[PDB]
Structure 1
Amino acid sequence: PGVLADNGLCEPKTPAGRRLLDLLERYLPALEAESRDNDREATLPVHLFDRMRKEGVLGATVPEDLGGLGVHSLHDVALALARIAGRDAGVALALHMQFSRGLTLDFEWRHGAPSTRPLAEDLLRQMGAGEAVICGAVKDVRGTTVLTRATDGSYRLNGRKTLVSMAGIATHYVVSTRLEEAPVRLAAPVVARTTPGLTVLDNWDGMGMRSSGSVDIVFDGCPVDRDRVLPRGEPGVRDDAALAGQTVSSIAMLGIYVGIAEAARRIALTELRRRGGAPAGVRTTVAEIDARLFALHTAVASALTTADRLADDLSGDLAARGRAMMTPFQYAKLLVNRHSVGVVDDCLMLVGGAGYSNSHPLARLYRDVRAGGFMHPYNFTDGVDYLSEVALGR
């Protein structure tokens, strides 16, 4: 079972969560069997996603009322991602897109602007039904994404977004973009896969996370309904309450890297147990590996707890609610990006040359684990700015 800990991401807190892990169990052997291939080929395992969608799994964070599995716990979500990542991190990183979207919409449905509340409800039932599969398209690429107002009211959308995981089998896209008018207001409109002007580019050549299908999407005069635009604030002038949402949609991903470090450790320990007597060099590494794992497990589970605590709690200063969620998140992230990578490095050096063959799982794991560092929010540079800002007053 590996490194165990109380409040350290080992068992699910909620029975929804429990149900979800049980469902995953039947998919894991397949995920694992296919992992090498999907990695070599850089190929999203569409077939397995079909089975999962049909067996209710892509509906996991969809409330029970709307036909989903009603997993509301970021802890449990993270934990589920860790299990999957144990077998294939690419795939987890993709399911995350769905799972988090569930939650982010589920908040909108209960607490968003009265007008958008039913659209949220719509998409949620669609996800529960196995019909809708939603990706966020966030990162612009050398050219900012803009939608403007066409002649008859209706808006036309134009831009290019990069690193959209799971976009392979997407049916919708929530596209964060700025809108052009005096005022410059920003928005995240829902856009169907079948929208004319939309092309999915298969240019995903990542060193790891290859099975995740993090492809680019170009929008070229895409028609967007007058009603599907959700204008929320504006660029530059940022509000700390936005940080709550920002937290909810990324935090769960940390389970992935814990998952990878766990997997690497498992492989390395069995390998060593299979050699007999243990040299003075390895005892130390193992002890260090496990100590770092424990540090990861607990640091992460704590941040998740904080986030789960304020997930619904809306009373109190909103700006402070954001900060209060984001800070533990960013601490844990800083820790994971340092330690998961070290654990994997050390598991690799403990196994030896065989681990360096690209076919070998450790090789895959070493390439996969380095992905976290890059993810916003935040990389190290921003991470420092944010966390020093919070600490020093400004």
Structure 2
Amino acid sequence: EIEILAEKIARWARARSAEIERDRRLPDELVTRLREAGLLRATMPREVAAPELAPGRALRCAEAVARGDASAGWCVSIAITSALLVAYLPARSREEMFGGGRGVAAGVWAPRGTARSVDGGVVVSGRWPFCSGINHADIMFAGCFVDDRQVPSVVALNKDELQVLDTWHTLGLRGTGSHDCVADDVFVPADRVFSVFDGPIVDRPLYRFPVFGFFALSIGAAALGNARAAIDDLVELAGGKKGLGTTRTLAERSATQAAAATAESALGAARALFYEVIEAAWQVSHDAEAVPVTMRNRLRLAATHAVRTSADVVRSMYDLAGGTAIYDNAPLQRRFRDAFTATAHFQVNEASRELPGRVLLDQPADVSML
């Protein structure tokens, strides 16, 4: 049923999409809707009054919201990924920050922070770009290195303690407000410092599902929903777009027909693989052993394929629309700008094909972050 709420919320995001972009943030009323549906805490554990939603359902919700507006969808993706880390907190700090239904999380994985140990915890400083959703998050999980360690850690920071810098001036995904955040000698109690590589404290199937795979897949979900919206925009425009020569509509051209078919099947294929691998990994997340590397590899293969295929689909629809889509009032223009902002994400760029290829070819590979 959360899926039905997500589709309703997608229609609200679509209605507000000009405001989202103009203000570089989600309207308060839209955040309230998302919160009341449980979408911004969907994957947090049941102990904090949260749905602990199965990953395929959560990702389908993000995809649905992104079809309404890619930035709104991306904020769901980042919220439901960051929410997983609530399962890595000791019970005391988990209750403090997320108990009784409280707390929305943001999260930047890049270990930009430097943390020094002190009596009771660490003192951390750093600057993190790409803090999606910080405008409506209470807590930001941030990567850092603690003293001498060569394996990075995560600190759970209150937004209160950070300086948010106005840096998010971007081609697309403007509504994500993915600004830089700065910590200046912030004290973090020891029980808000952890290592993802040590695994969750809440050891149930949702947190056995590959966490780095889920993050990648959440970007795929937003990209896929955006590409679906782009096809829908094209199809609506074509047929009515008549032009001024004595040929006729855009939809009546063979090239438009072949391109529509090519895009529809490419997107359908990417989406089908996406949900197939999620379900396969979800099944084995119920087993005693850690989800294996072969399965983790399939998730990363599918996430990157989804983002890259989505961009190819949106580029094709934009190109078909010709002089219509170059203007700021054209819906396809924002889809295009959003699709080509999403492609830059480090989990799903062209470079992200190389490690999953090494795994396929049985080559030596560091798979700690697969």
Secondary structure of 1:356's partner? coil
- The aligned residue for residue 228 of structure 1 is 192
CA pair 244-120 structure 1, distance change in 2 beyond 3 A: same
- The aligned residue for residue 344 of structure 2 is 374
- The aligned residue for residue 302 of structure 1 is 276
Q: Does 1:339 align with 2:309?
A: yes
- The aligned residue for residue 76 of structure 2 is 95
Aligned AA (2:302): A
Deviation per residue, 1:178-223 (Å, 9 max, x gap): 1114x5453212111223xx20112101211110010111110001
How far apart are 1:364 and its partner, in Å? 0.2
Q: Which runs of 5+ in 2 are unaligned?
A: 199-207, 242-248, 365-370
- The aligned residue for residue 324 of structure 2 is 354
- The aligned residue for residue 106 of structure 2 is 135
- For residues 78 and 227 of structure 1, the distance between their equivalents in structure 2, rounded to whole angstroms, comes to 29
- For residues 343 and 293 of structure 2, the distance between their equivalents in structure 1, rounded to whole angstroms, comes to 21
Q: Does 1:329 align with 2:299?
A: yes
TM-score under structure 1 length normalisation: 0.80
- For residues 57 and 245 of structure 1, the distance between their equivalents in structure 2, rounded to whole angstroms, comes to 18
Retained in 2: the 8 A contact 1:174–1:190?
yes
How far apart are 1:94 and its partner, in Å? 1.1
- The aligned residue for residue 59 of structure 1 is 41
Q: Does 1:80 align with 2:61?
A: yes
CA pair 96-248 structure 1, distance change in 2 beyond 3 A: same
Retained in 1: the 8 A contact 2:219–2:303?
no
Find 2:182's aligned residue among 212, 218, 222: 218
- The aligned residue for residue 288 of structure 1 is 262
Find 2:126's aligned residue among 159, 169, 174: 159
- The aligned residue for residue 113 of structure 2 is 145
- The aligned residue for residue 384 of structure 1 is 354
How far apart are 1:93 and its partner, in Å? 0.9
Q: Does 1:363 align with 2:344?
A: no
Deviation per residue, 1:128-181 (Å, 9 max, x gap): x2x3111112235xxx4211023x444211111110100112211112111114
Aligned AA (2:269): A
How far apart are 1:32 and its partner, in Å? 1.0
Secondary structure of 2:130's partner? strand
CA pair 304-121 structure 1, distance change in 2 beyond 3 A: farther
Find 1:119's aligned residue among 80, 85, 93: 93
How far apart are 1:27 and its partner, in Å? 2.5
Deviation per residue, 1:28-69 (Å, 9 max, x gap): 332112212322443333441134324543232234554223
Aligned AA (1:252): S
Secondary structure of 2:160's partner? coil
Q: Following superposition of structure 1 onto structure 2, how do residues 234-273 of structure 1 map, counting pairs within 5 Å?
A: 244-273=210-239
- For residues 84 and 156 of structure 1, the distance between their equivalents in structure 2, rounded to whole angstroms, comes to 38
- The aligned residue for residue 113 of structure 1 is none
Aligned AA (1:291): S
- The aligned residue for residue 174 of structure 1 is 141
Deviates more, 1:165-174 or 1:58-67: 58-67
Retained in 2: the 8 A contact 1:154–1:223?
yes
TM-score under structure 2 length normalisation: 0.85
CA pair 46-179 structure 1, distance change in 2 beyond 3 A: same
- The aligned residue for residue 206 of structure 1 is 170
Pairwise CA RMSD of aligned residues? Answer: 2.6
Aligned residues: 348
- For residues 44 and 196 of structure 2, the distance between their equivalents in structure 1, rounded to whole angstroms, comes to 23
Aligned AA (2:193): V
- For residues 79 and 387 of structure 1, the distance between their equivalents in structure 2, rounded to whole angstroms, comes to 27
Provide the identity percentage.
20
- The aligned residue for residue 19 of structure 2 is 37
- For residues 303 and 382 of structure 1, the distance between their equivalents in structure 2, rounded to whole angstroms, comes to 17
Retained in 2: the 8 A contact 1:252–1:304?
no
- For residues 236 and 94 of structure 2, the distance between their equivalents in structure 1, rounded to whole angstroms, comes to 47
CA pair 24-155 structure 1, distance change in 2 beyond 3 A: same
